[PDB]
Amino acid sequence: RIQQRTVDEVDADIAVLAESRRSAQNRLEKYQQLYDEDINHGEQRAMSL
């Protein structure tokens, strides 16, 4: 029984790390979109005028 509980514990830790991964990749792709778009048309207009 005790070892059943321990394998349960490690499975829970797997889930914890998995949702950690989801959060990290969210931050990543948000940064990536924010970086690729670089400078939008508003600042282009500011500099041009």
Binding site: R1, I2, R5, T6, D8, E9
Partner: protein, 48 residues
């Protein structure tokens, strides 16, 4: 994990309980200190 530690506690608890019961068995066995005490005394007297 806390619940795991808890049934570990009661694990050790049951282990202690049944080792106590085993002690009770060893006392209550047929060839106990009463039988050996009687035999020692009677043999020693007759031997002397």
């Amino acid at each position: 994990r806390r619940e795991a530690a808890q049934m570990q506690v009661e694990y050790q608890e049951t282990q202690q309980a049944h080792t106590q019961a085993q002690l009770e068995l060893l006392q209550r066995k047929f060839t106990n200190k009463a039988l050996y005490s009687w035999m020692r005394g009677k043999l020693s007297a007759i031997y002397y």
